Structures are given as C-alpha cells and as structure tokens.
Motif scaffolding. Structure first.
Motif, PDB file in Angstrom:
ATOM      1  N   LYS A 126       0.797  -1.209   0.000  1.00  4.90           N
ATOM      2  CA  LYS A 126       0.000   0.000   0.000  1.00  4.90           C
ATOM      3  C   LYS A 126       0.834   1.265   0.000  1.00  4.90           C
ATOM      4  CE  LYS A 126      -0.843  -0.847   5.000  1.00  4.90           C
ATOM      5  NZ  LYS A 126      -1.852  -0.935   6.079  1.00  4.90           N
ATOM      6  N   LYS A 127       1.936   1.283   0.789  1.00 10.02           N
ATOM      7  CA  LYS A 127       2.874   2.379   0.892  1.00 10.02           C
ATOM      8  C   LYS A 127       3.677   2.572  -0.370  1.00 10.02           C
ATOM      9  CE  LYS A 127       3.554   1.682   5.943  1.00 10.02           C
ATOM     10  NZ  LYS A 127       2.646   2.784   6.336  1.00 10.02           N
ATOM     11  N   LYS A 128       4.016   1.454  -1.050  1.00 13.69           N
ATOM     12  CA  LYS A 128       4.886   1.416  -2.200  1.00 13.69           C
ATOM     13  C   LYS A 128       4.224   1.905  -3.464  1.00 13.69           C
ATOM     14  CE  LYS A 128       7.294  -2.440  -3.021  1.00 13.69           C
ATOM     15  NZ  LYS A 128       8.557  -1.703  -3.254  1.00 13.69           N
ATOM     16  N   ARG A 129       2.866   1.923  -3.518  1.00 14.58           N
ATOM     17  CA  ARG A 129       2.093   2.142  -4.725  1.00 14.58           C
ATOM     18  C   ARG A 129       2.435   3.379  -5.512  1.00 14.58           C
ATOM     19  NH1 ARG A 129      -3.382   0.030  -1.798  1.00 14.58           N
ATOM     20  NH2 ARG A 129      -2.899  -2.257  -2.115  1.00 14.58           N
ATOM     21  N   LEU A 130       2.186   3.280  -6.841  1.00 14.41           N
ATOM     22  CA  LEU A 130       2.370   4.311  -7.832  1.00 14.41           C
ATOM     23  C   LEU A 130       1.415   5.437  -7.547  1.00 14.41           C
ATOM     24  CD1 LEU A 130       3.502   5.472 -10.543  1.00 14.41           C
ATOM     25  CD2 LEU A 130       1.772   4.057 -11.746  1.00 14.41           C
ATOM     26  N   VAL A 131       0.128   5.084  -7.347  1.00 14.30           N
ATOM     27  CA  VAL A 131      -0.873   5.978  -6.832  1.00 14.30           C
ATOM     28  C   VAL A 131      -1.322   5.239  -5.616  1.00 14.30           C
ATOM     29  CG1 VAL A 131      -3.057   7.185  -7.101  1.00 14.30           C
ATOM     30  CG2 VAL A 131      -1.576   6.691  -9.121  1.00 14.30           C
ATOM     31  N   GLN A 132      -1.016   5.779  -4.413  1.00 12.65           N
ATOM     32  CA  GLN A 132      -1.400   5.123  -3.192  1.00 12.65           C
ATOM     33  C   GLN A 132      -2.756   5.613  -2.799  1.00 12.65           C
ATOM     34  OE1 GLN A 132       0.403   7.361   0.621  1.00 12.65           O
ATOM     35  NE2 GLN A 132       2.037   6.270  -0.564  1.00 12.65           N
ATOM     36  N   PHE A 181       4.991  11.007  -8.696  1.00 10.00           N
ATOM     37  CA  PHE A 181       4.395  11.111  -7.380  1.00 10.00           C
ATOM     38  C   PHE A 181       5.265  11.723  -6.315  1.00 10.00           C
ATOM     39  CE2 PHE A 181       0.023  10.222  -6.187  1.00 10.00           C
ATOM     40  CZ  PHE A 181      -0.521  10.132  -7.472  1.00 10.00           C
ATOM     41  N   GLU A 182       5.230  13.066  -6.289  1.00  7.38           N
ATOM     42  CA  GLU A 182       5.920  13.905  -5.355  1.00  7.38           C
ATOM     43  C   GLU A 182       4.860  14.905  -4.993  1.00  7.38           C
ATOM     44  OE1 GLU A 182       5.393  15.032  -8.878  1.00  7.38           O
ATOM     45  OE2 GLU A 182       6.297  16.776  -7.837  1.00  7.38           O
ATOM     46  N   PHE A 183       3.747  14.382  -4.430  1.00  2.00           N
ATOM     47  CA  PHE A 183       2.488  15.068  -4.344  1.00  2.00           C
ATOM     48  C   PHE A 183       1.559  14.041  -3.759  1.00  2.00           C
ATOM     49  CE2 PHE A 183      -1.853  15.891  -6.119  1.00  2.00           C
ATOM     50  CZ  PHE A 183      -2.113  17.064  -5.401  1.00  2.00           C
ATOM     51  N   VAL A 184       1.550  13.963  -2.403  1.00  2.00           N
ATOM     52  CA  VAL A 184       0.475  13.532  -1.523  1.00  2.00           C
ATOM     53  C   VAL A 184       1.014  12.354  -0.775  1.00  2.00           C
ATOM     54  CG1 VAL A 184      -1.848  12.567  -1.112  1.00  2.00           C
ATOM     55  CG2 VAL A 184      -1.519  14.530  -2.647  1.00  2.00           C
ATOM     56  N   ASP A 185       1.705  11.475  -1.533  1.00  4.18           N
ATOM     57  CA  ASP A 185       2.320  10.242  -1.120  1.00  4.18           C
ATOM     58  C   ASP A 185       3.295  10.353   0.025  1.00  4.18           C
ATOM     59  OD1 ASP A 185       3.999  11.321  -3.313  1.00  4.18           O
ATOM     60  OD2 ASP A 185       5.087   9.386  -3.255  1.00  4.18           O
ATOM     61  N   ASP A 186       3.715   9.168   0.508  1.00  3.20           N
ATOM     62  CA  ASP A 186       4.527   8.961   1.676  1.00  3.20           C
ATOM     63  C   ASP A 186       5.967   9.316   1.413  1.00  3.20           C
ATOM     64  OD1 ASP A 186       2.423   7.855   3.133  1.00  3.20           O
ATOM     65  OD2 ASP A 186       2.931   5.759   2.603  1.00  3.20           O
ATOM     66  N   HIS A 187       6.367   9.328   0.127  1.00  4.03           N
ATOM     67  CA  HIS A 187       7.740   9.418  -0.287  1.00  4.03           C
ATOM     68  C   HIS A 187       7.764  10.371  -1.444  1.00  4.03           C
ATOM     69  CE1 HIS A 187       6.545   6.612  -3.580  1.00  4.03           C
ATOM     70  NE2 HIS A 187       5.887   5.942  -2.653  1.00  4.03           N
ATOM     71  N   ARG A 188       8.903  10.410  -2.170  1.00  7.09           N
ATOM     72  CA  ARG A 188       8.966  10.995  -3.485  1.00  7.09           C
ATOM     73  C   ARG A 188       9.625   9.931  -4.308  1.00  7.09           C
ATOM     74  NH1 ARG A 188      11.681  16.998  -3.111  1.00  7.09           N
ATOM     75  NH2 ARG A 188      13.521  15.629  -2.577  1.00  7.09           N
ATOM     76  N   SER A 189       9.510  10.019  -5.649  1.00  2.00           N
ATOM     77  CA  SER A 189      10.000   8.968  -6.504  1.00  2.00           C
ATOM     78  C   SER A 189      10.286   9.564  -7.849  1.00  2.00           C
ATOM     79  CB  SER A 189       9.033   7.755  -6.609  1.00  2.00           C
ATOM     80  OG  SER A 189       7.694   8.154  -6.876  1.00  2.00           O
ATOM     81  N   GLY A 190      10.826   8.736  -8.766  1.00  2.00           N
ATOM     82  CA  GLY A 190      11.056   9.159 -10.112  1.00  2.00           C
ATOM     83  C   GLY A 190      11.437   7.953 -10.896  1.00  2.00           C
ATOM     84  N   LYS A 191      10.619   7.634 -11.928  1.00  2.00           N
ATOM     85  CA  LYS A 191      10.950   6.709 -12.982  1.00  2.00           C
ATOM     86  C   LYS A 191      11.921   7.398 -13.891  1.00  2.00           C
ATOM     87  CE  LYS A 191       6.958   7.760 -16.070  1.00  2.00           C
ATOM     88  NZ  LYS A 191       5.820   7.177 -16.814  1.00  2.00           N
ATOM     89  N   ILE A 192      12.957   6.671 -14.352  1.00  2.00           N
ATOM     90  CA  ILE A 192      13.970   7.260 -15.186  1.00  2.00           C
ATOM     91  C   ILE A 192      13.730   6.774 -16.581  1.00  2.00           C
ATOM     92  CG2 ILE A 192      15.614   7.666 -13.392  1.00  2.00           C
ATOM     93  CD1 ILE A 192      17.143   5.102 -14.340  1.00  2.00           C
TER      94      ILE A 192
END
Lengths: 121, 86, 130
Positions: B22-28, C50-61
């Motif tokens: 759930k935490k890992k999701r693309l859109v959580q 997803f650097e907007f709302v989520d628990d973390h930030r991320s980036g597909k390269i």
RNA sequence: UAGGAUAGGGGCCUACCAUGGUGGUGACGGGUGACGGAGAAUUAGGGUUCGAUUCCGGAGAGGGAGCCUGAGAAACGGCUAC
RNA sequence: CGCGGUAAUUCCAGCUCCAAUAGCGUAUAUUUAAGUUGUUGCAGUUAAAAAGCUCGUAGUUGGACCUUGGGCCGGCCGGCAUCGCGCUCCUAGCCUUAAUUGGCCGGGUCGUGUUUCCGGCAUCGUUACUUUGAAGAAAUUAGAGUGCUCAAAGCAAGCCAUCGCUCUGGAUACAUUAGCAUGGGAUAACAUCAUAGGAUUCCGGUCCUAUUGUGUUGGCCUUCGGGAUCGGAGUAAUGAUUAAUAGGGACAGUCGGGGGCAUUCGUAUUUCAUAGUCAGAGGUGAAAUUCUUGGAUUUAUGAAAGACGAACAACUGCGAAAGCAUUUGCCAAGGAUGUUUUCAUUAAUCAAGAACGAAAGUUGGGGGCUCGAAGACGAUCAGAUACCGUCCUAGUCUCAACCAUAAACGAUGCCGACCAGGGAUCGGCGGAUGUUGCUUAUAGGACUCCGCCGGCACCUUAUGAGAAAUCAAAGUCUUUGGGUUCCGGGGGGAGUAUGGUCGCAAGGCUGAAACUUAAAGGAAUUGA
C-alpha cells in the motif's frame, strides 16, 4: 490523490467534536470510533486531526508498557522455568524506556514523572 | 519482453498494484473502502468500513451486519451491499 | 543511510540487464544526481513521479542506452555525507582522465568539476562518473 | 574570603570558610637515546620514520640545596653548606 | 631456495667473462616494495579472521516540507521585477518645485544654500564547512633571475669612456593543528511560536534618565524624547510540516511442536504378587564370563515405580538464541498479516554494562525405571586398559541453586536500497453467483485457483563476484570510499606462560614472550 478526496467529501466540523470528543474522554479508544460510526465523519480524522487535548494518548504507550510488564513479572514469581518469557520481559522493558525517551522531549511534567512511573502504574 | 517497468507505466494492471504494498504504490490509496450495507429492518442503509474489526450491528434493527475476520469483513447470512461512499 | 550510492549502484547493474529504467524512491541529494545527468546528457529526459500527496517521493527514469553504446559506462559512489574526506580546487583527485567528470557539491550548490575549479571553490566528492 | 610576599595577578604560601575538582572525548598511573620546533630521510601521491647537532626557544653544567652582587644569575671557567 | 657422497657452470685456485668504477662490499636501524597496516587503499563460505544470543549506552550515524523557485534585460557575470523584513545615525545617489542668493525673463529658465528624491549597505538566534585577506623566522626545501668558468651550490652579478661609472638584484611558494577577520548561505547539526510569557501603528497612568532651551553654579520637574514597569483596546494564512519501501503504540481475526502452571492419556521398559509349564537364556562373526528345579526363558493379569511421547513429523512451524511434539484448562506473552486509528523522527548499530544461555560436572532435596564414564569381568589382543560382550556408580529425571562453555553452525555480523526467471509449501489477506460443504440458506472452513504482504527454503540460469569448488548472495570493492560494529594481519611456541578478573569446584574469561622455522593452510586437477 487520496488526501484531497477525503478533505472535500467528508465533513470536518460539528460532526467530529461530538462523535469523537465524547468517546475519548469516556476513555481513549480512538481506533474504536473509526471501526464503527458513520464513515464519512471518520474519513478525515487522519487527514485533518492533530488530536484535540485529552488525558491519555501521549501517556498511552507508556501506560500500556507498564501494564503488560506487571503481568509478565507476576508469571516470573511462579516458575523460573519460563526461559522464553524472561527474554520477552527483557526485550519489552528495554523497548519501554524508548517510548518515554521520545515522548518526554515535547512536554513538561514527563521528565520528572516517567522515570518513577515504571512499575507503580 | 524486456520490461522492468511497463510499456504504459501510468496505467498498470490492478494485479500489479496488488503486488507492491500500500505504501509502495504508484498511486497510493486505501485499497479498503466504505460501502453501504443494506438491511430490510431499517428504512435507511448504513455506511460501514470494509474491515469491520468490531462486530457492527445496524443502527435501528438488531439484525447484525457482518462479523469480523483477518482481512475485509466476512458478511453473515442474507444481506446485500453496494460499494459506495462520498 | 543517504540514498545516493544506491542510485549509482542500481544504475550500472541495470545497464548490464538492458532494462529501460528501474524506477525507485528518491530523496533530495538524489534529486541532484539526476539533474547533473541531464546536463552532461546521460539523460535526455527525467521525470519525477508522485511527489504530491504520497509517503515518499520517486522518479521513474528514462535513460540512455537501448541505443548502441551505453552513455554511462560506470558511475560508482565515492562516499556519502557524515564523513570527512575533502578536496579543494587544487587538491583534485579524479577518475577517468577528463572523459568523465567528478561530481562535486560545492559551496553554492552542485555543479560539475570544471565549473567549480574555474571559480576556485572546493567541496566534497559525491561520486565518480567515468 | 583575607593577608603577606614578589615586578605582578596568582593556593604562591599561610589563616579562616565551604566541600569540592577531574575522568571512556582514556583522565590518574607507568615507560620511553621522550628535549620541543623549524626542519631531515624515504615515500608518485597519501604516508611512514626521525629530530644529538654551527639556527630558534628552554633545561643543566660532578650531584643537590641555599644565596650575594647587579638592569638582570635560583650563575657554576661565583660563593656557601653537605 | 639450495649445493659438496670424486668428469660440482653453486666449492677452492687459475683463466676468461660480466658488471659498478675512485669507488664497491658487509652489518644494524629505518623507508619503499608491503593494500604486511589497508585515509588514499584490505580480508573474514571453504585459506589467518563475526562475538552463543539479544537488549543497549557512551560513541558514531540518521528522511522529507524548510524565502525557495521562476522571469527580464545589459555586457557565466552585473543589475532587475515576484513572496529581495526593518530603524536611529553615519556614510550617502541624482533630479524635480530653483526657492534665501546670482544672472535672465511674454520662461518662475538654471545652479548653489535649503524641502522632496534613490544607488551603496554596519548592528538586530548559534555553529561546523568552504572563501579571501592579515598574522605569518632565516636556513632547509621547491623555485624566479644569474657562467660560483662547469658543477655541487651560492646570492651574487653584468656593462663601462676597462684612468675619472653605469645599473639590475637579494623574487615567490612552502609557513601544516588551531586562532583572527571578511564573503558565501548549499550541505550537517544546536536551535526553533500551542498552557503562546510571541510581533504592534493603537493609548493611559506609574516610574527613571537630562542634553537642548537654559549666562554661570547649587535644592526640588514640567513639557519632551528615550529606557524601565503594570494594565486596557487594535491588525494579520495570527501562533502545531508530512505521517520515510524509517520506528513505536492502539485495535481485529488469527498462527505456531513459543513459555509456565494445573491437568489427562498411551503403550513400552522394569519390578512384584498370582498363573502356567519344562531347557535353555544373555550373546555373536565365533564363544565365554553371567543367569538357569533357588523351573528360569516365556506366558497372562492387576498394581507399583520411574521414564517418554514411535509411526504420525515434512528441503514444514515457532521462539532472541540455547531450544520446542499426548489431551485439556487458566495465565500473561511474540511474530507475521490487516488497518483513511494514534505519536511524529521517537530511528539505525554498538566498547561498557545488563538478561537468557544444550550437554557434562555440581549444591541440597525429591527420585533412581531405564541406561550407563570409572571399575570389575569374556573374547580379540605380544600389550587392549578399547571397539565388541557382561556387571554397573556418579549421573540420566525433576525442583530451588551454581555454572557460562559447544561444529552454541548458515564455519557465512546487524541493518537498508538495488540487480533474475519459475513452481511448491507455511501463515494471513483479497477477488470466483468454482468444487466439497448443506452450515435453515449462506458466510466460513478444507480443496482448486490467480493476485499479494511477510517466510523456511528449493529449482534453473548468474548479468556479476571468487583462487576455484560454488554463490540471487560469498552480487552490487579495482565500477576500489552506504551506515554501524567485531575480529584477523605467517606457521609453530600458545592459547600456554604470566598478571588481572571470575567461578562453588572443574576450570573459564582476558592473554604474551623467549626460542624455532619456510612454508603452514585452502580449492580444484592429475597419479598411486
């Protein structure tokens, strides 16, 4: 995505100090409210709630740690043979100090009280 | 094929969002949901959390509703439900 | 830890795989490495999902290779933060031999080896681009 | 805290007063051709090792203590004592 | 390392040759080699080397929001506009009304004194880092310049009308921890507004300070400015950032050969009494000691005693680990999982220090069925003290105590991210108008499934590592530096000696050196 949806379509005011500010001064039980009630109201508890002022909560982790500890100690007055149980007791009390390390820095009274509090409620 | 990531990353299948936590999701989001569960005895239908946890009873009728289980609630006997919430 | 090294290590093993990316969680000193890649054109595009709302930030390269030659032959870490090993503008140890650059967080911000050297300002190496 | 001393602050010593100070960031103790430094050798570099030496600063001048004179010596190719 | 046991390129002479050459051997210390000291720049599956395990500190290390980001011109740099705080004064950028004043004038034209007007930025919560600059002994060293004739080096020197003097030097760097000052504001901390003791244009009264004004000097302040103090009324996004593929806690249904205590059962083995009856039995490869009308062996039935949980029980489980299988009850416990619940960085990992820690030995009880070191017996054996046979004590068992060690093992630290395909099984969850179920019907549950978190592991390739054997970790260390800790750093001596420490004791833990010596050791390969 998630958080915006909650904020908009929930409630926020009125419905939440009435449902939740009663149950918490009745005695804790924050998780109980979310698993019952009228859904939309508790939808936004995580997305808009610091926590109202309350007795407990900050004190809950500390209280719970002492509460479990005393019962293990009771079963360590009967038979020494519980070699498994003594190391659960050893582990959990060393976790107990951690709880009252972190929840001692934000507010007063805790610094004096919580050292003494261990084993006497 | 050569895929690490998908050809359309933005829309993955739901099964591959059931992969990652759930935490890992693309859109959580909550994969959990609210639903209205329907009871003949009450005129209105009561909104309920999917993972009940407590044995929830319907507000007016003492019919019951569901019983709790380790995951999403295990509904008991003849009751019906639609999945919705605002 | 600090991520940084994890990105670099993951990048080179993924090149051997011939994947078109790996996608991962990112931080703020690992925001830096990606923008530097864009400048020296190991990336001709990067996207921070997803650097907007989520628990973390991320980036597909989206990453160079799947072409002919790999652009990034090696990138390998040369110490994260929390340590004292330090270079100056005159001290310069290097990898490569000028084909690559040496990643440097300088006083003003992160810039490449030549920019920092000209301005005559030292800093601490983050990694070795060959 | 006070005083006497000395060029002067100074536990410097000494009275009265309080009961402290300092330590795992290795104190306290022992060892060391252990003088210290600028420097030297040798190392690509990084380092390692060395520093008795025509310089720089201090100590001692057979071992120890004590003192005269004088701007200045607790002198030693001065004294005084053991 | 090796040679010399009588045709020794290894000796001893000669010859000849090599090779440094006014120099070369030899010894000791020291640097390199030696990444054998691993900062740069190590190794620990099996070669030297992860502590038994966990908690856990000093100590190290540690996520993200975070007046930052963007746009324009001018020539990366300068200066601008948004979301580039502010005031006293200093310092201070130009011009407008040009006014006292001067020259003009159908002009308030222009400039100065003077009002308005701006560049340019000192102080106004701490640093580390970095920048520039000072402060910075000569020598040495690197090094400018230069024919000390060369040169090592030195700081001299080169030109003349060489009989009427001319001039250049004697640079610069090094100056290393730290300290100063200035600039930067990224990266790291201390730190920081929620019980607000916060900012403030509002204003009071109280109360202090005294220069201007005042001739001067002395006692006492009004107005006033600025402090100090205590209240009333005002303004503003007024005063807590998420909720780490970081951590805890709450809660739900579970899971497990987790723990303890109470408890219940099974047959077995042993012994006893009663029963029956007539030669072997123990034993083995072969025998014998040993036991046999003191009718054994065997047989059955009860009872006692003590032990243990076969087969089921698994490349399967749980527990920190050591370890843990009959039933049932109670008591607290732990992981995984689920969770728009809560806290908000509490965390990571560790010298020290603390808890637990198979077996044996033990301290005292219970208890001694079984088995069984020593001993004692028979073969075997020159010896046999053993394997093997037979007797059997301590002990095995349990309880309160000691103890602290194991091939306590995954010979593989802990933690985190990543790099590769596939199927099982253990656990939970989700989806199926599936099956079985028949639960009133259903939901469940067992079964079949696919998806999935977290597992114990296998399988096949291994991109890659490795010395290879092998290994999805022994990978991601030569692509040399993720965080933390422990240990090794030739073999023996020696894990002993000694000292300290501890233990009830055994003895443990900590742990050298003299001296010896060129291999010890690993994996694979080929012989025998």
């Amino acid at each position: 995505a998630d958080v915006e949806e909650m904020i908009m379509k929930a409630a926020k005011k009125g419905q939440m100090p009435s449902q939740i500010g009663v149950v918490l001064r009745d005695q804790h039980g924050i998780p109980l409210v979310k698993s019952v009630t009228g859904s939309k109201i508790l939808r936004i508890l995580k997305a808009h709630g610091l926590a109202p002022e309350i007795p407990e909560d900050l004190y809950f982790l500390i209280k719970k740690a002492v509460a479990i500890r005393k019962h293990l100690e009771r079963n360590r007055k009967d038979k020494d043979s519980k070699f498994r149980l003594i190391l659960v007791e050893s582990r959990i009390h060393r976790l107990a100090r951690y709880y009252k390390r972190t929840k001692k820095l934000p507010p007063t009274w805790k610094y004096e009280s919580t050292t003494a509090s261990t084993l006497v409620a | 094929m050569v895929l690490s990531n998908d050809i359309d990353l933005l829309n993955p299948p739901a099964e591959l969002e059931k992969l990652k936590h759930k935490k890992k999701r693309l859109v959580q989001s909550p994969n959990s949901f609210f639903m209205d569960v329907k009871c003949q005895g009450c005129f209105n239908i009561t909104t309920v959390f999917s993972h009940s946890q407590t044995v929830v009873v319907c507000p007016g009728c003492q019919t019951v509703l569901c019983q709790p289980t380790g995951g999403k609630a295990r509904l008991t006997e003849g009751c019906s439900f639609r999945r919705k919430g605002d | 830890m600090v991520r940084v090294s994890v990105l670099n290590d993951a990048l080179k093993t993924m090149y051997n795989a011939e994947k078109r990316g790996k996608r991962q969680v990112l931080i703020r000193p690992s925001s830096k490495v990606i923008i530097k890649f864009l400048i020296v054109m190991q990336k001709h595009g990067y996207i921070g999902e997803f650097e907007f709302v989520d628990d973390h930030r991320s980036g597909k390269i989206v990453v160079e290779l799947n072409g002919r030659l790999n652009k990034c032959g090696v990138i390998s870490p040369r110490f994260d933060v929390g340590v004292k090993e330090i270079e100056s503008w005159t001290a310069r140890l290097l990898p490569s031999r000028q084909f690559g650059y040496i990643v440097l967080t300088t006083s003003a911000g992160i810039m490449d080896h030549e920019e920092a050297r000209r301005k005559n300002v030292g800093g601490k190496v983050l990694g070795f681009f060959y």
